[PDB]
Structure 1
Amino acid sequence: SVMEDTLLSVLFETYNPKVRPAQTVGDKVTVRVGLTLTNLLILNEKIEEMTTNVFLNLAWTDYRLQWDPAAYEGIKDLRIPSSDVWQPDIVLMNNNDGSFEITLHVNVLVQHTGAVSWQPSAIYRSSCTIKVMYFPFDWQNCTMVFKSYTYDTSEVTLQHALDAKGEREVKEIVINKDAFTENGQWSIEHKPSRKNWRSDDPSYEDVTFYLIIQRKPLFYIVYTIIPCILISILAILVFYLPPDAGEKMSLSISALLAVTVFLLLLADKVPETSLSVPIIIRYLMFIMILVAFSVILSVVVLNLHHRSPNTHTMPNWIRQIFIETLPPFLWIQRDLKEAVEAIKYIAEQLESASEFDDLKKDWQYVAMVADRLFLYVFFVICSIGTFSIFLDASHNVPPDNPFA
């Protein structure tokens, strides 16, 4: 018989995976935990859930799993199925769904000194609060919490996993360059691991793998921000179409419809959290209100253009404010006698019509000057708003100190 079988028979003749491996009564088992992120699958902001494919590195010392390699046939290590040895149940304490335990259940690695190095794999679904503000030009602080569900500080003692060299300790998430495929949307900025305690409860020990991840906003800045900028450019042009074209309100209401369409599309992507408002939704609302005010002011300009002496009389204040002061500041400036009686009548009618035309052209001049003023004001306001929003977005860099 292969001596591995006899060694397995000797080890497990009285072994019980229901008892802690504390050598003396009341002793604690120093459990080392760590993470090896192989793939950050997705971060579903709709349900505030992060799905990661990880290799939960574990290492605890069991006093029962000891043997002398010289006594046997030089066996120095062994592979044992994970359901046969005692196991501290390091579960994801902040899982979004009900998946607590590990998925794969790979074999543990028991060495002759008693050290057990278990590296199971799982598809974990943790839950993290999404900082909805500054979305999508945002960095997230999504965390994974790993501690023994049943045992507490009186029975175990969590630590940090070591490195390939046993003399060094790792305080960060291990990434294997060969197997780790970078997620196409998120960039791993910082990844510290730090045991955080509870001041109000001594019987609590935690190891948390903080994962500072930066969103790459190119998709949103390509499918939403650029079309919104184009719609803003259209909305500025509404204050440049002449009133006679009969297309100012059509163009402005089409721009408003486009803005609302883009707003409703993003409803499937933005988080449902009501704590704050993301910067992209804030920008959408700013553009929508700007286009609505453009619609209102183009309605005002159309009203001022279509006014006539027989329906409105021009007040003196609007004259003094739109003909005198503002055009300088906007670069805008400028039997048989019955036939004689009939021709006199038609000439008088022509003179009255020309005076009426002059007054309504003065109304049109007021409308045009107001339209140009609205053009400049809206241009300045939209430029300042976009610059301020983008400056706030660009300064949302995660801090260099992750605070572990």
Structure 2
Amino acid sequence: ADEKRLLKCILHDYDTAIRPVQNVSDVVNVALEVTVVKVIDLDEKEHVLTTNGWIYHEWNDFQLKWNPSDYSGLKKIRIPVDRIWTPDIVLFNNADESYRYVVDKLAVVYYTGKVMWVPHARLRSFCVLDLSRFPFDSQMCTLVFGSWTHDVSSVNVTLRNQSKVQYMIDGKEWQVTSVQPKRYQWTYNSNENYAGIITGIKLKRTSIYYQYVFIMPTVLLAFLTLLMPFIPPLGKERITYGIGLVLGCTLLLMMLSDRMPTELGNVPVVAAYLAYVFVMVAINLLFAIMAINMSMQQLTRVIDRLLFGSFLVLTVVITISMYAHY
């Protein structure tokens, strides 16, 4: 067949390690575009972002050159990348042992020498996230692609400006929206430059899981702690009520500590609210113990009334602040 003829012709002496430049003072312009098809997860316990998508490679191999008229058309031809040269472009913030692709067995080569690859992949990428508004947090995770072997004088990583589009994924957790990728240049020993593309995706947590698990038991334990100082001290049920709030808030703290990551810069607002509720139970237990201590003078109810007034107004302020965060 004619498809075997050009394949045996233009791969008769091809070496997969030779950089395809006609002159020694020349580079190859490798065009990249990462496109996410599905954001799988954002594991903040280990600061990784698991995602699925395809990275569009496009370079210009001048050694694979022919005219279609000698082969009766056939502009497109498909070669595995194990027999042609490929640029070593990997993630700059890879979060696993080795970088592997889902499909990497074919690459489209045109008659003009330009080569497309498009290997689909599952990318685990490190991305910095600040949990100062957990779980009502808007995020931004970056994927950095580039060459760690070839410098700028060997290859040139270029974004494609012909498709300056933006896309969105309406996940049930994250309302993922994309940011226009840019090029940022990393140096090496202040002489050699190692270029690379950077692509941000702006995650936005729209969750009903973390609200139901963390927001509503914390505000209801706050409600019970506010209901506590109407209990009269001379029956001996206020102290066991307070220690029940202590145990329930300890269980809620253990929930939160199981879910909140170790890799933490600032305290989340749900954690600060839970700490506020926990120390509020502590202060109310102090007031109950003092009240029953001098109950053995009996004009205690105005102290509990002003304590409920202060805790009511400050709890309304704190809850309104957390609602303004949401």
TM-score (norm 2): 0.93
Distance change in 2, residues 1:101/1:155 (3 Å) = farther
Q: 2:273 aligns with which of 278, 283, 292?
A: 283
Partner of 1:292: 282
Deviation at 1:242, TM superposition (A): 2.0
Distance change in 2, residues 1:128/1:30 (3 Å) = same
Distance change in 2, residues 1:16/1:174 (3 Å) = farther
CA distance in 2, matches of 1:58, 1:182: 27
Partner of 1:383: 316
Partner of 1:372: 305
Partner of 1:192: 180
Counting aligned pairs with the same residue, the percent is 30
| 8 Å CA contact 2:172, 2:207 repeated in 1 | no
CA distance in 1, matches of 2:177, 2:282: 40
| 8 Å CA contact 1:173, 1:193 repeated in 2 | no
| 8 Å CA contact 2:55, 2:119 repeated in 1 | yes
Equivalent residues in 2 for 1:165-204, closer than 5 Å = 168-170=162-164, 182-198=170-186, 203-204=193-194
Equivalent residues in 2 for 1:196-275, closer than 5 Å = 196-198=184-186, 203-275=193-265
Equivalent residues in 2 for 1:99-138, closer than 5 Å = 99-138=98-137
Deviations 1:292-321 (A, max 9, x none): 1111112222223x32xxxxxxxxxxxxxx
> How many aligned positions are there?
324
Structure 1 gap segments, 5+ residues each: 163-167, 176-180, 308-362, 395-404
Partner of 2:148: 149
CA distance in 1, matches of 2:207, 2:288: 35
Partner of 1:43: 42
Partner of 1:4: 3
| 8 Å CA contact 1:91, 1:146 repeated in 2 | yes
Richer in strand (by share): 2
CA distance in 2, matches of 1:104, 1:236: 59
| 8 Å CA contact 2:33, 2:57 repeated in 1 | yes
CA distance in 2, matches of 1:201, 1:260: 56
Structure 2 gap segments, 5+ residues each: none
SS of the residue corresponding to residue 139 of structure 2 reads strand
Richer in helix (by share): 1
CA distance in 2, matches of 1:190, 1:54: 13
Q: Which amino acid in structure 1 is aligned with residue 99 of structure 2?
A: F
Deviations 1:109-141 (A, max 9, x none): 001111111100111111112212222221222
CA distance in 2, matches of 1:48, 1:147: 21
CA distance in 2, matches of 1:189, 1:278: 24
CA distance in 1, matches of 2:98, 2:281: 48
Deviations 1:321-340 (A, max 9, x none): xxxxxxxxxxxxxxxxxxxx
CA distance in 2, matches of 1:49, 1:64: 40
Q: Which amino acid in structure 2 is aligned with residue 16 of structure 1?
A: D
Q: Which amino acid in structure 2 is aligned with residue 388 of structure 1?
A: S
| 8 Å CA contact 1:30, 1:61 repeated in 2 | yes
SS of the residue corresponding to residue 58 of structure 1 reads strand
Report the structure number with the largest CA radius of gyration.
1
Equivalent residues in 2 for 1:329-340, closer than 5 Å = none
Partner of 1:70: 69
CA distance in 1, matches of 2:282, 2:178: 43
RMSD across aligned C-alpha pairs, in angstroms?
A: 1.9
| 8 Å CA contact 1:35, 1:173 repeated in 2 | no
TM-score (norm 1): 0.76
Deviation at 1:182, TM superposition (A): 4.3
SS of the residue corresponding to residue 244 of structure 1 reads coil
